[PDB]
Amino acid sequence: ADSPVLMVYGLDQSKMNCDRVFNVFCLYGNVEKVKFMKSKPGAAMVEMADGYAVDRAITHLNNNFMFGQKMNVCVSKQPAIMPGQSYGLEDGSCSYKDFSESRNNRFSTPEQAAKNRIQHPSNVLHFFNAPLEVTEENFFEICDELGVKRPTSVKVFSGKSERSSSGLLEWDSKSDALETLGFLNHYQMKNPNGPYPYTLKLCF
Ligand SMILES: [Cl-]
Ligand SMILES: [Cl-]
Ligand SMILES: [Cl-]
Ligand SMILES: [Cl-]
C-alpha cells in the first residue's frame, strides 16, 4: 500500500484498547502506533512498519466479525500517526500507544519476519511459548480470569524440542477465536519448574 497507516472501524468500545489492538494486528506485521479517536467511536488508526504489513492486515482482517460488529480495515490517507489530545478509554487505559520498541513485535528483522504464519482467522488459534507442562485446564482458568470464552478444546502438541509447549486453542466459531486473541495474546504464564514466566504467543 502507499501508506503504513490503516484505519480500523467497527471496534467494540467497551472491550478494545491499544494493547488488544496490537494483540490482533501484530500477527500481520510490526505495529508501530495505535491511536483511538474521541470523535470516531469504534475506530482506531494503526501505523504498521510498512505498506506490505498494511496490505496483509487488510486482506486478513477486513470484514471479520468481533463482538457483534463487522470490523473494517482499510488504508488511511495519512502518512503517519501523531499523538493528539490523549484520553482514558472506557477500561482506564490510554487512547494512544507507541509499540515501536515492543519486544512482542514479530517482524523486527527480515529473517524473523519470514517465520510468521500469515493466515486468515479461523476457529483455531495456534499457540507457542507456553510452559513445558501446560494443560487445557491452565488455559481454561486464564480465560476465566480474563473474562473471555474458554476454548471448547485445547491440544498441546506432544513433540517438544525446547522447554516450552505449542498447540491449538479451538472455539466453536471464528468470531470467538478473534475476540479471544485480543485479550489472550502475550499473556504472562506462570512457570512451575522454571525460573521466569512465559509470554504466550498466539497466531492463526
Ligand atoms: Cl460476532
Ligand atoms: Cl503461512
Ligand atoms: Cl498462568
Ligand atoms: Cl518468554
Q: Look up the CATH number of the domain holding residue 119.
A: 3.30.70.330
12 phi and psi, to 5 degrees?
A: -85, 115
- On whether both 3 and 80 belong to a single domain, the answer is yes
Report how many domains make up the chain.
Answer: 2
Question: Among all chains, which residue has been given the C-alpha cell 481454561?
Answer: 140
Tell me, in angstroms, the distance from the centre of ligand 1 to residue 67's CA.
4
Instruction: Give the span between the Cα atoms of 40 and 90, in whole angstroms.
Output: 14
- Name every residue whose Cβ is closer than 8 Å to that of residue 21 and which is 6 or more positions away in sequence: 8, 11, 31, 34, 44, 46, 182
- Answer whether residue 86 is part of any domain: yes
Q: Which residues pair with 96 in a beta bridge?
A: 35
Tell me, in angstroms, the distance from the centre of ligand 2 to residue 41's CA.
33
- Answer whether residue 77 is part of any domain: yes
Q: Where are the beta strands (DSSP E) in 27-158?
A: 31-36, 44-48, 65-66, 69-70, 72-75, 96-98, 124-130, 153-156
What domain range is 68 assigned to? Answer: 1-100
- Experimental technique behind these coordinates: X-ray
112 phi and psi, to 5 degrees?
A: -65, -40
- Answer whether residue 129 is part of any domain: yes
Residues by chain with Cβ below 5 Å of ion ligand 1? 65, 68, 175
- Answer whether residue 81 is part of any domain: yes
- On whether both 131 and 173 belong to a single domain, the answer is yes
Q: How many residues does the chain have?
A: 204
Classify each residue of 119-136 as buried b or exposed e, where b means 16 or more C-beta atoms within 10 Å of its C-beta.
eebebbbbbeebbeebee
Residue 68 in grid coordinates:
457483534
Residue 95 in grid coordinates:
487512547
Contact 16, 182 (CB under 8 A): yes
Tell me, in angstroms, the distance from the centre of ligand 3 to residue 142's CA.
7
- On whether both 95 and 117 belong to a single domain, the answer is no
Tell me, in angstroms, the distance from the centre of ligand 2 to residue 134's CA.
25
- Answer whether residue 185 is part of any domain: yes
- On whether both 85 and 123 belong to a single domain, the answer is no
In 48-188, alpha helices (H) = 51-61, 110-114, 136-146, 174-184
Residue 118 in grid coordinates:
500469515
Question: Among all chains, which residue has been given the C-alpha cell 507442562?
Answer: 133
- Answer whether residue 105 is part of any domain: no
**Within 10 A of 90 (CB to CB), how many other CB atoms are there?**
11
Tell me, in angstroms, the distance from the centre of ligand 4 to residue 189's CA.
9
Contact 178, 125 (CB under 8 A): no
- Name every residue whose Cβ is closer than 8 Å to that of residue 128 and which is 6 or more positions away in sequence: 164, 165, 166, 201, 203
Tell me, in angstroms, the distance from the centre of ligand 3 to residue 152's CA.
19
* 94 phi-psi bin (left φ>0, alpha ψ -120 to 50, beta other): beta
